[PDB]
Design a protein around this ligand. Structure first.
Ligand SMILES: COc1cncc(-n2c(=O)[nH]/c(=N\c3cc4cn(C)nc4cc3Cl)n(Cc3cc(Cl)c(F)cc3Oc3ccc(F)cc3)c2=O)c1
Ligand SMILES: COc1cncc(-n2c(=O)[nH]/c(=N\c3cc4cn(C)nc4cc3Cl)n(Cc3cc(Cl)c(F)cc3Oc3ccc(F)cc3)c2=O)c1
Lengths: 305, 305
């Protein structure tokens, strides 16, 4: 019983964090096999950050300009190359703690675990969600650049996020491990703003199902709704539209609880129109939208109350 | 910037989880050096759980009755002994991944990281707090027994919690690594209830300071309060009394923000009497009480907005 923001164990990823330095610019890197991945921003000097031409700055660099430190052990760079916004540094030693891994790109609404890292040493782990506007509401301080996000699926680490920068609104932006940014952002020290954000409807419903499985039911009702009438209410409250396919993914949760998806939508509509009135759901006074259907199954018993 | 429930990286603890089996009872264990720690409840058969005499059941057991599995590697037990509610199994191999560690007991209101484990393999990590009634509001399923809580302080793992059981209210109870339970609970499969819970006042104020450091200030006011007048309001709302020493620990946060502790108390009193009115603090519509002053410093910049 219980429900909490849960991150994957970070052990398999801890053994891959390294420190990467170019001149006086320093940040975190990810050492897998004999390659080190890190943001290409590391090759910028302070005066290059405002408006860099990266492939003009990279030709001007040599291997011995890159200092890679795994703990106290210095790694020697034997080759470099640029892949979009990610710099790939070929080293002489294959990381002995390299786990099975893939490079995956996540969709808006999906979640992942984040290993906050400073100077190559991890400091914390927590769960995050990719917002519909392609930012994340993480917790990052100066020097966190290079930190990575990931999911774990039977020993295999799916890396999906590399942290790059903070935005004026206090949200964070980054790329996948291929160097392709999430959203309409770039690697330049100019002020960039995120688009307007929305609420992940399917995630809300999954969280409501989690509540039912954990014994809460006050928000349920006897009313029913159609998919479209719900969407007309959701749009007025800045909720993402619900697709008929979004309903199918909620099938397993609907069957284990015996509550039709559109019946759970009826409760969501009423919650949107009357608030919660000081009442709470799973210890929260807001509707939580950072738990996917998969997170709910991963945590909740297979048997309802 | 940002604020999130953050757990310590679990890598150093992952390398110590093992599976312990006695007869058909199975649960998680902690392998440090050549000793394996686990709940003594593992030596109970189904019919012994309702009312066991543990030192009567332990004399009836021999070393070869205990199967210890670290992954697929079986460990051979060369000695056993009971320390309060914790069973200590001496094995022949010293764990090569044994980190520097201490055994510490935490106080009500302190936080720790929890590594949820099933059959000796970790499945998740998250942050928890010890409630004033000595329970924790964790996320645990059947088989999580033996999971451990911990803090990490410069390479050294301070183990502080070993999970034992779930209560009828859905909260969780356990012991320190010495086998001494937290709160008035025992290891018997009988229904036990937790005392009434309270809100950790000092933690609330620390969370309010975290908000100020991250740019939020709408809840601040110009009013001032004395320590006692606040306590008279807090008692009516089931808040823990604030001691003059509790104020001193909030000193660093008060100085970095320039807000007198009793001024922050004035805001708390008004928040208690008028609610939040649909407004949020750090993305929460409730007053959060699971962040200590130390957690706030660990996460927030040393420079306020
Ligand atoms: C606490 O809040 C934070 C949370 N998370 C991350 C950060 N954070 C950093 O930690 N370091 C940043 N720059 C660096 C400065 C350095 C000085 N040294 C010696 N080494 C360095 C390495 C880096 Cl990377 N930056 C800005 C940034 C990083 C990158 Cl990759 C980039 F491509 C552009 C860019 O400029 C922008 C871009 C957009 C924007 F809206 C504002 C500034 C940044 O935001 C701060
Ligand atoms: C999902 O919710 C949960 C979240 N976290 C933990 C649990 N959870 C377990 O996972 N296993 C439990 N028993 C076991 C059964 C087993 C069958 N096999 C083959 N192996 C076994 C090993 C154990 Cl340990 N128990 C009860 C419990 C464990 C211990 Cl140590 C104890 F000392 C007494 C006791 O009985 C009580 C005590 C108080 C109470 F209010 C209710 C029952 C338990 O609560 C459930």
């Amino acid at each position: 019983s219980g429900f909490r923001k849960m991150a994957f164990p970070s052990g398999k990823v801890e053994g891959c964090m390294v420190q990467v330095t170019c001149g006086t610019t320093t940040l975190n890197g990810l050492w897998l096999d004999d390659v080190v991945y890190c943001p290409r921003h590391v090759i910028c000097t302070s005066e290059d950050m405002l408006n860099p031409n990266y492939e003009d700055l990279l030709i001007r660099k040599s291997n011995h300009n890159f200092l890679v430190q795994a703990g106290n052990v210095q790694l020697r760079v034997i080759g470099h190359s640029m892949q979009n916004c990610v710099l790939k540094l070929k080293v002489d030693t294959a990381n002995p703690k390299t786990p099975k891994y893939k490079f995956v790109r996540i969709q808006p609404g999906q979640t992942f675990s984040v290993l906050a890292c400073y100077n190559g040493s991890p400091s914390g782990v927590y769960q995050c969600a990719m917002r519909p506007n392609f930012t994340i509401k993480g917790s990052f301080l100066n020097g966190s650049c290079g930190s990575v996000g990931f999911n774990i699926d039977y020993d295999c680490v799916s890396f999906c996020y590399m942290h790059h920068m903070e935005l004026p609104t206090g949200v964070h932006a980054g790329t996948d491990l291929e160097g392709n940014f999430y959203g309409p952002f770039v690697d330049r020290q100019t002020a960039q703003a995120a688009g307007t954000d929305t609420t992940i409807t399917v995630n809300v419903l999954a969280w409501l199902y989690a509540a039912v499985i954990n014994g809460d039911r006050w928000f349920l009702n006897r009313f029913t709704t159609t998919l479209n009438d719900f969407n007309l209410v959701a749009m007025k409250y800045n909720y993402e539209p619900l697709t008929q396919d979004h309903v199918d993914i909620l099938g397993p949760l609907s069957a284990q609880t015996g509550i039709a998806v559109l019946d759970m939508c009826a409760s969501l509509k009423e919650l949107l129109q009357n608030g919660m009135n000081g009442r709470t759901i799973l210890g929260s006074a807001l509707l939580e939208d950072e738990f996917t259907p998969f997170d709910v199954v991963r945590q909740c018993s297979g048997v309802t109350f």
